[PDB]
Design a binder for these strands. Structure first.
Ligand SMILES: [Mg+2]
Ligand SMILES: [Mg+2]
Ligand SMILES: [Mg+2]
Ligand SMILES: [Mg+2]
Ligand SMILES: [Mg+2]
Ligand SMILES: [Mg+2]
Ligand SMILES: [Mg+2]
Ligand SMILES: [Mg+2]
Ligand SMILES: [Mg+2]
Ligand SMILES: [Mg+2]
Ligand SMILES: [Mg+2]
Ligand SMILES: [Mg+2]
Ligand SMILES: [Mg+2]
Ligand SMILES: [Mg+2]
Ligand SMILES: [Mg+2]
Ligand SMILES: [Mg+2]
Ligand SMILES: [Mg+2]
Ligand SMILES: [Mg+2]
Ligand SMILES: [Mg+2]
Ligand SMILES: [Mg+2]
Ligand SMILES: [Mg+2]
Ligand SMILES: [Mg+2]
Ligand SMILES: [Mg+2]
Ligand SMILES: [Mg+2]
Ligand SMILES: [Mg+2]
Ligand SMILES: [Mg+2]
Ligand SMILES: [Mg+2]
Ligand SMILES: [Mg+2]
Ligand SMILES: [Mg+2]
Ligand SMILES: [Mg+2]
Ligand SMILES: [Mg+2]
Ligand SMILES: [Mg+2]
Ligand SMILES: [Mg+2]
Ligand SMILES: [Mg+2]
Ligand SMILES: [Zn+2]
Lengths: 60, 206, 24, 78, 70, 155
RNA sequence: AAUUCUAA
RNA sequence: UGAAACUCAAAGGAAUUGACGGGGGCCCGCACAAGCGGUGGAGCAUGUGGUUUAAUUCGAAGCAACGCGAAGAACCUUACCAGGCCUUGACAUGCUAGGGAACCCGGGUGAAAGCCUGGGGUGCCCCGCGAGGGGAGCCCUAGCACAGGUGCUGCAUGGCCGUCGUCAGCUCGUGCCGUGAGGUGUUGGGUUAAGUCCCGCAACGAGCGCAACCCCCGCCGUUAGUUGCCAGCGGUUCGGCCGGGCACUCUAACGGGACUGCCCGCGAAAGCGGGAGGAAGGAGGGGACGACGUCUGGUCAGCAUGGCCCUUACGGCCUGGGCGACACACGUGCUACAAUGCCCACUACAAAGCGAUGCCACCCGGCAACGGGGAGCUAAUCGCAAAAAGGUGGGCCCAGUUCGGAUUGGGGUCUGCAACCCGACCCCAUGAAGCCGGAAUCGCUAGUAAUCGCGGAUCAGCCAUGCCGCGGUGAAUACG
């Protein structure tokens, strides 16, 4: 119900209402920023590697 | 479970990004995804070179793919047959012009991602981990450096009692920003658990 | 009070507009 | 609540409708508890799916704007 | 399975659990179903009532006798 | 407050009378940090003063606030299985706070429906050594002295 | 002037 | 005076290192005391136990689980159940055969899935105009190797994380004492936020830590002008509207500035008290960062992976129900119990963000939600937009009331295939409990607590009173 699931987040069958986000690195379905397209985990793990454009840990 | 990445912590200053290219909130997503799909294919067929980094620049509708390595060879072949079929495979799934490149690393022992895969491999090849660590560090500090540090997660030697063998030499202030410390991390994959290794190489400063 | 859906703060705290709070 | 229409599922009417010509039997299964009972249905019982099975829910005048799903409880011992 | 229950007795105790629990259950062909589940059952799980939380064992018996002469 | 002897935050002089105390009293009438709708009330009272006593609202203060200063109150301690609530002197600083506080509290009790009225009235009766606020003064002073049995216990 | 915490 | 049977694999001496003490010495933290506002009571929202149920998916469990995963459950999401279907299959890879090799609009049937089915025709390798089929894409069905699993194990594991703890610590090399475990260093004397520094000393240095480098708020200047500006005159429909002008404001980029440097008092030093200059002193206010390790902590359900396990189903698909259940009990919360107040109208002042099937100027119909029209905007130059408390003059006049908005009847708008379960606002009518909260218990030492409102992530919509930020007003008190 994981792989066979992301394999439907890709398509847009009947109605648009069933159109829902989904992380890209993994199949994360919750907490996914339409912007980056990554979950909150992947997002953090990457920003650490530096593989995230213009992104950097804030501080104020 | 503390300590945070020493890279995303230096991003601001010390360390540069690893994929710099301004972008609009309408593109950033698809493009950022591109860099990954690229770092992904270059991950496999290139592992024999030691892809110790992959900086990717882009002005627009182009790509500055640069595979820095301490040992090119297999990257090119002996003229331009290999390194050519890779520029081939790249844009062979990227609607843009994959401008490929290949740099060199003088001292591979002073490269984290490398020393990482190093020990990470002596592991899958059943080696005295207590040694591989004290030896790999005995490679850096010796081959010119100021600090060294290796770490291996649980399942060492195969013992069901998942340990975590330390071992470091020199200096490694992950708290000090003005220092620049190279970090690496590879994953040995054995019959039992799935060990993990961390590399810490201290270099310059100010 | 901030729950009287038929008043001033009624809509303020609510974030809507109605007969009891037309848009200016 | 809808304002322009009556969101009654296709198979709902299409079936019932022809069933009105000469007044067919009655046993009419369904899975559209999420539809509506427009007038003219009076008399025709429907086998609504409470999620588990078909409930022989009778239809009468009074109950109109109400839906089919609003006649087949879905939990027990409320 | 339908059968009904009658808690003849039930008493707690000191730290945690239950000291003695006796019950009467009816419903067609009942004893025949619980007669088999007669003996001492063992359990292995992390003892909550421990500091280290070590893996611990526990024994408790289940007797089964039908309501006959009254 | 185990290290520093803390610090006595400073009260900025009034913006009408120029009194660093005429404010400390307003501060106590301040609910939700609303000093405007608070100091206002106070000021609507000073007019309740000059209108029920030629007395200018200043000594109606230096008097009601002076007739409330408890000379000595009680601060409990425990030597060990000792339910001794020792009586003892009051910090000149503390005195004022207890005063002003009790003045407001008392005020907020009177049956006067408005507000300034209460403060105004309570200020007069307290000035007149007979306000609900002084009741708290003697009441507090009763406990003290009445237990001078524990004079060797002023921690 | 204040009890107790089984046994991997 | 003085046994034995039986029984255990130790009983024990000293000395280590720790942990512990209702031992002691010194010193800290909103720990207490000092003081202000809450919870516990009521109604409701929400998370949990319980019970219930066809199912009410699962995990989290003192602190450190309970507005937690969940930064968006009507079908989706979804892991649960009932029912209808599908098997190399929703996806990867290689391969097999006659098919077949881009391929396109439907018909029928059913709840949908699905089963079935009615037509266009394949650039081309090109012996070759041709029959043909080599033919690259590469879809159709059978067959093979395999796929698939939020099924189990967080005591098989990685990574990431919580926590003691931003605590002042934990260690190393060599030497010296010790038979040894280990000790000295790191104790002691003075000091600080600190294993901070100083002073001694069988010790001498060194590493991980603190500190410092980094960012934000402060003051100042350099560069920069479509933000702003009669600062100066100008014309000004009198709105920086306009030419005009970088002076302000300000925007964002690089610097400067504070160091116990100076004076006075103590002192062996370190450093403390205190003086002036200054926007700022003795880490200037907040962030960033969190050691050796601890809790067989958390996480196989984000993911990765060892081992076990189901593989025409422990897989896959759809319709529908469920996660929203309710005699109860607990946690976090919202709004109240009114006059420092509530209602009505008028008039003001922010910040940080945010916008292409997006934010909507202004009109218009509508009591209104909202709905027709429509300009601006790729956005310091247009929109969200009005901030609210306040200022203000006026209606209530102490009453369950003009306090309170729960419940419920009737009628609507918006997103969406569709709001019965189970959505959000709108309006009319209902106007419940609560008159300040038992034993207990929580937070906060300053632009803090209290109180007020705005924006953002998620996202069709939204159950958001939640979470992450911002600024308006602005305290009380610290003896110890
Ligand atoms: Mg969604
Ligand atoms: Mg129903
Ligand atoms: Mg007993
Ligand atoms: Mg006992
Ligand atoms: Mg014990
Ligand atoms: Mg013997
Ligand atoms: Mg001994
Ligand atoms: Mg005692
Ligand atoms: Mg206290
Ligand atoms: Mg309550
Ligand atoms: Mg599980
Ligand atoms: Mg907690
Ligand atoms: Mg939600
Ligand atoms: Mg659903
Ligand atoms: Mg599902
Ligand atoms: Mg399942
Ligand atoms: Mg664990
Ligand atoms: Mg300690
Ligand atoms: Mg020692
Ligand atoms: Mg040090
Ligand atoms: Mg020393
Ligand atoms: Mg000092
Ligand atoms: Mg555990
Ligand atoms: Mg657990
Ligand atoms: Mg897994
Ligand atoms: Mg996965
Ligand atoms: Mg079967
Ligand atoms: Mg549901
Ligand atoms: Mg739930
Ligand atoms: Mg348009
Ligand atoms: Mg306007
Ligand atoms: Mg109150
Ligand atoms: Mg504090
Ligand atoms: Mg004070
Ligand atoms: Zn993800």
């Amino acid at each position: 119900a994981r792989k066979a699931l992301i394999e439907k987040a890709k398509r847009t069958p009947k109605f648009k209402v069933r159109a829902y986000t989904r992380c890209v690195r993994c199949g994360r379905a919750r907490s996914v920023y339409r912007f980056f397209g990554l979950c909150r985990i992947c997002l953090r793990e990457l920003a650490h590697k530096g593989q995230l454009p213009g992104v950097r840990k804030a501080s104020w | 479970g503390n300590k945070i990445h020493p890279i995303g912590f230096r991003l601001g200053i010390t360390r540069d990004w690893e994929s710099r290219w301004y972008a609009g909130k309408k593109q950033y997503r698809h493009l950022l995804l591109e860099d990954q799909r690229i770092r992904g294919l270059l991950e496999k067929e290139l592992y024999s070179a030691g892809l110790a980094r992959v900086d990717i620049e882009r002005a627009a509708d182009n790509v500055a793919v640069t595979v820095h390595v301490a040992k090119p060879g297999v990257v090119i072949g002996r003229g331009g047959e290999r390194i050519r079929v890779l520029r081939e495979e790249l844009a062979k799934l990227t609607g843009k012009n994959v401008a490929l490149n290949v740099q060199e690393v003088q001292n591979p022992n002073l490269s984290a991602p490398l020393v990482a895969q190093r020990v990470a491999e002596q592991i899958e090849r059943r080696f005295a981990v207590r040694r591989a660590i004290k030896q790999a560090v005995q490679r850096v500090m010796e081959s010119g450096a100021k600090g060294a540090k290796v770490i291996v997660s649980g399942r060492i030697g195969g013992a069901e009692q998942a340990r975590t063998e330390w071992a470091a030499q020199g200096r490694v202030p992950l708290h000090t920003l003005r220092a620049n410390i190279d970090y690496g991390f590879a994953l040995a994959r054995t019959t039992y658990g799935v060990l993990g290794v961390k590399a810490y190489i201290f270099l310059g400063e100010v | 009070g901030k729950g009287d859906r038929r008043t001033r703060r009624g809509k303020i705290w609510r974030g809507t507009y109605g007969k009891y709070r037309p848009r200016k | 609540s809808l304002k322009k229409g009556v969101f009654v599922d296709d198979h709902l009417l299409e079936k019932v409708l022809e069933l009105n010509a000469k007044g067919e039997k009655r046993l009419i299964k369904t899975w559209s508890r999420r539809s509506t009972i427009v007038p003219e249905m009076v008399g025709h019982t429907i086998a609504v799916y409470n999620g588990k099975q078909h409930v022989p829910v009778y239809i009468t005048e009074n109950m109109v704007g109400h839906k089919l799903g609003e006649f087949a409880p879905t939990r027990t011992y409320r | 399975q339908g059968f009904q229950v009658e808690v003849v007795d039930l008493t707690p105790g000191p730290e945690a659990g239950i000291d003695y629990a006796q019950i009467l259950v009816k419903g067609e062909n009942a004893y025949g179903l619980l007669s088999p589940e007669a003996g001492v059952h063992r359990l292995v799980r992390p003892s909550p009532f421990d500091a280290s939380g070590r893996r611990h064992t526990s024994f408790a018996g289940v007797e089964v006798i039908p309501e006959v002469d009254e | 407050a185990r290290r520093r002897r803390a610090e006595v935050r400073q009260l900025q002089p009034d913006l009408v009378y120029g009194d660093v105390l005429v404010t400390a009293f307003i501060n106590k009438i301040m609910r939700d940090g609303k000093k405007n709708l608070a100091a206002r009330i106070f000021y609507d009272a000073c007019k309740i003063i000059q209108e029920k006593t030629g007395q200018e609202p200043l000594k109606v203060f230096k008097q009601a606030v002076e007739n409330v200063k408890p000379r000595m109150e009680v601060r409990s301690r425990r030597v060990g299985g000792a339910n001794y609530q020792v009586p003892m002197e009051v910090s000149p600083r503390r005195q004022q706070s207890l005063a002003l506080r009790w003045l407001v509290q008392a005020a907020n009790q009177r049956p006067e429906r408005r507000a300034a009225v209460r403060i105004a009235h309570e200020l007069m009766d307290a000035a007149e050594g007979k306000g609900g606020a002084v009741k708290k003064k003697e009441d507090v002073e009763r406990m003290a002295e009445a237990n001078r049995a524990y004079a060797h216990y002023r921690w």
